[PDB]
Scaffold this active site. Sequence first.
Site, PDB file in Angstrom:
ATOM      1  N   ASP A 149       9.218   8.165  -0.670  1.00  0.00           N
ATOM      2  CA  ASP A 149       9.606   8.722  -1.945  1.00  0.00           C
ATOM      3  C   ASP A 149       9.342  10.216  -1.920  1.00  0.00           C
ATOM      4  O   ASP A 149       8.284  10.666  -1.475  1.00  0.00           O
ATOM      5  CB  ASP A 149       8.800   8.107  -3.083  1.00  0.00           C
ATOM      6  CG  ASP A 149       9.143   6.656  -3.344  1.00  0.00           C
ATOM      7  OD1 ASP A 149      10.243   6.195  -2.970  1.00  0.00           O
ATOM      8  OD2 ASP A 149       8.303   5.979  -3.957  1.00  0.00           O
ATOM      9  N   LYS A 152       0.844  -1.191   0.000  1.00  0.00           N
ATOM     10  CA  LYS A 152       0.000   0.000   0.000  1.00  0.00           C
ATOM     11  C   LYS A 152       0.878   1.238   0.000  1.00  0.00           C
ATOM     12  O   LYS A 152       2.019   1.200   0.431  1.00  0.00           O
ATOM     13  CB  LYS A 152      -0.943   0.007   1.202  1.00  0.00           C
ATOM     14  CG  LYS A 152      -2.169  -0.870   1.026  1.00  0.00           C
ATOM     15  CD  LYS A 152      -3.141  -0.682   2.177  1.00  0.00           C
ATOM     16  CE  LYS A 152      -4.361  -1.600   2.053  1.00  0.00           C
ATOM     17  NZ  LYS A 152      -3.992  -3.051   2.097  1.00  0.00           N
ATOM     18  N   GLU A 153       0.341   2.340  -0.494  1.00  0.00           N
ATOM     19  CA  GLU A 153       1.120   3.547  -0.693  1.00  0.00           C
ATOM     20  C   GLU A 153       0.214   4.699  -0.349  1.00  0.00           C
ATOM     21  O   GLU A 153      -0.996   4.601  -0.533  1.00  0.00           O
ATOM     22  CB  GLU A 153       1.489   3.630  -2.157  1.00  0.00           C
ATOM     23  CG  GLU A 153       2.791   4.275  -2.463  1.00  0.00           C
ATOM     24  CD  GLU A 153       3.096   4.187  -3.940  1.00  0.00           C
ATOM     25  OE1 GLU A 153       4.129   3.571  -4.292  1.00  0.00           O
ATOM     26  OE2 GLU A 153       2.284   4.701  -4.750  1.00  0.00           O
ATOM     27  N   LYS A 197       6.385  16.525  -4.174  1.00  0.00           N
ATOM     28  CA  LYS A 197       5.431  15.449  -3.898  1.00  0.00           C
ATOM     29  C   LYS A 197       6.083  14.358  -3.059  1.00  0.00           C
ATOM     30  O   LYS A 197       7.199  13.919  -3.354  1.00  0.00           O
ATOM     31  CB  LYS A 197       4.898  14.851  -5.208  1.00  0.00           C
ATOM     32  CG  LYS A 197       3.740  13.876  -5.029  1.00  0.00           C
ATOM     33  CD  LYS A 197       3.219  13.338  -6.353  1.00  0.00           C
ATOM     34  CE  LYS A 197       1.826  12.740  -6.165  1.00  0.00           C
ATOM     35  NZ  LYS A 197       1.254  12.184  -7.417  1.00  0.00           N
TER      36      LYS A 197
END
Lengths: 155, 173, 173, 155
Positions: free
Chosen positions: B120, B88-89, B101
């Site tokens: 990230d 999941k992210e 972002k």
Amino acid sequence: STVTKVIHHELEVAASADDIWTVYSWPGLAKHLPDLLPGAFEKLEIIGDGGVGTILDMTFVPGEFPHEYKEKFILVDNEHRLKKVQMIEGGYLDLGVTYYMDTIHVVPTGKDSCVIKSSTEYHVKPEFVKIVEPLITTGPLAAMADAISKLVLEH
Amino acid sequence: SQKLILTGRHHQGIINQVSTVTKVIHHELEVAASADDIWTVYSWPGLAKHLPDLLPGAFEKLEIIGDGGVGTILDMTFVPGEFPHEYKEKFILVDNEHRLKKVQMIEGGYLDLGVTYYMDTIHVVPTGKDSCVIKSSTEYHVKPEFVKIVEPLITTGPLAAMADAISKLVLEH
Amino acid sequence: SQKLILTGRHHQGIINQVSTVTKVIHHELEVAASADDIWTVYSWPGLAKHLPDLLPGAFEKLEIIGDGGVGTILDMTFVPGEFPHEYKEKFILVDNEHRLKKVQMIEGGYLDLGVTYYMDTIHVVPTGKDSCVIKSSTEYHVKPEFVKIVEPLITTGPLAAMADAISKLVLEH
Amino acid sequence: STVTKVIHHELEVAASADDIWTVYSWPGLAKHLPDLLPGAFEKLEIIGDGGVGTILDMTFVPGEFPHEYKEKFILVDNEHRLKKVQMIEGGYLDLGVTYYMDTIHVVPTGKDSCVIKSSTEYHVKPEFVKIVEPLITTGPLAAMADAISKLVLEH
């Protein structure tokens, strides 16, 4: 181009090979795996009656490796007291492993004694042999051994 | 035949779970398109549901929970053989002003292989009138006994493949 | 081919949801076995995972969450064609002293068809040295505009089939 | 032994049949259904590219009927501006219905005007005709109509 690895585990038990074997081969055992291994499984799906052909989907608690894999009860041999279970989807097969087998062999020593000879064989691409050998252990088989032992050592 | 599923219901040490080392890996894709053009695609809330389009045959299954803005969760399942098989992210930050972002692994993937935190960051910075760098970096915290195991896997790949695929879209008239 | 799943994220009136009528339906299976024998099967925590055995071809899928005692949840999926197709169920009460068991529909099933509350009660009461009544009843609360629709469906069937199947087991030596 | 029922819905719209039709036939529309119908779907799974052959699994918010059903984009006819979508699993098919079809037909009236003729046909066992007729309505089709209308009535 795959490298073959085979790991072994042995466990002496003060019970007859036949007694330890009825439990290992017992088709009702599949649905009792959370009873033998408390807290080991988050979720255990059983497709089949627990005899050969039965597939088990296994998902484990967050943090653990193989998070999830399927398994197939592939072979049983009552005379030799031998059982083979294959990893068929997920787990190490998403990590360069092209084959994964567990063999359980209960061999008697004396009248009321036996060894549990558990082994697992796998085939890995050379690129993944080093990534995957610190991960694959005899753990899941040793757990089966200790649980079945203790449950059967009750007069 | 008979499907039967059984789910039952112990925690680790408070120091053990923070007993990690930080590793940071960078990727820089300098492309011949304006930072504004690359950013409008990156910050586009419709991008989530078009990831199968952008990246064909990467996903066996893609679930998106939420509108696509900050807060959105992406559940990604990959084809057999590939690894990370599923994680999941979450969209943590979509900062228009800074063209910044952040997306976080919140469950599954490397989190089941010794990693305790995985971020990230994508920063799109101008280099000229019609050029920019896409600076993608990932910061993860690993249990040090697992760094040998997890480092060859955690590459700059998935965010490098993103940057190239977005760049290609833009560089087309 | 390409699987893509999308899940986004308004409530009803506070009087509307309680605007129901109670309906109670009873079933009595008087059998030639002691109440103790019938009860030991009903209260047996291993019964959940043996429901496929007890009731072959009823379930397409059976998930059980918890040990089998009070608190346990049963997620039942039935074969195509059959209806209620899927619902969750909960073990509310397992009272040895009174030979009393309560199980509740907590999600799905008739709850999506106007029903706001649904309770099975099973009471095993002696009738003699080797005989008892299994009194199964279900109490549901329906929006009254739906009673025409839901009443032919809500029968005494699933708990009648339970009682017979348990009785058969016991009455075998 | 099944009874056939057919229900109808019409909607006049101040736009060309061709404009309303491009949206109805648009293969990208499937993944935009939550955008057109906010809060209607709890969960929408799309198998396929949104063209014919595409299957849609639809699960709805607790309380609503059909809680869940699958759907197949079965036919498209651009010249006649006609579209057929079949319920293939779940929903009313677990309730005595053996066939369930939706037809959408966009027929022009004037130069810049059209009707949306939406219908649904089903076949039910006589035992279930009365259980199921207060449940099946033109609702899901009328919703498609109102949403597409308004989205297209923007100059």
